[PDB]
Assembly symmetry: C3
Homo-oligomer: 64 residues x 3
């Protein structure tokens, strides 16, 4: 009755098959990678318009 | 005369080309990942019918 | 005015978009992997003809 078992159990038959654990691990990994990358971007895009201009980029670099 | 050189040497010409080392490293990696994942599954599937029901899943989690 | 911002800024509009940072990180990663692999090959291919014969392969292995 936890959303996690249901999230992994994609065809909803009450059983987590191997393919499902595998698809899950894959997408969980993909998501953590997206989140770290976005967070890094947003962190460089100091003013938040959604693009990094040469200035934001300049600050970001150096002794970093 | 070791099975390993022959395993990497896929077109069998006595020479391991770069593509072959590369294909080999790729598939070796893929296999270690499958094996760890399967072992983890089999380890959760406490009764071995090949699917994880909410119970096996429940035990598995917690302070894990 | 650094080649790096221009290298990431693929469509050249002065702005590094997210897709571009992402494509960049991907290809940077791909390249480091190629370079390490090639260096390892070249390191096994002791005489440099571009293929590893059973002999070069033999030396390479052991207590390695
Ligand atoms: Pb299922
Ligand atoms: Pb900006
Ligand atoms: Pb060959
Ligand atoms: Pb089971
Ligand atoms: Pb751009
Ligand atoms: Pb050689």
């Amino acid at each position: 009755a936890e959303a996690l078992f249901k999230e992994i159990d994609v065809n909803g038959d009450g059983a987590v098959s191997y393919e499902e654990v595998k698809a899950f691990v894959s997408k969980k990994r993909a998501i953590k990678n997206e989140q770290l990358l976005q967070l890094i971007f947003k962190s460089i895009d100091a003013d938040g318009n959604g693009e990094i201009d040469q200035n934001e980029f300049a600050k970001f670099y150096g002794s970093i």
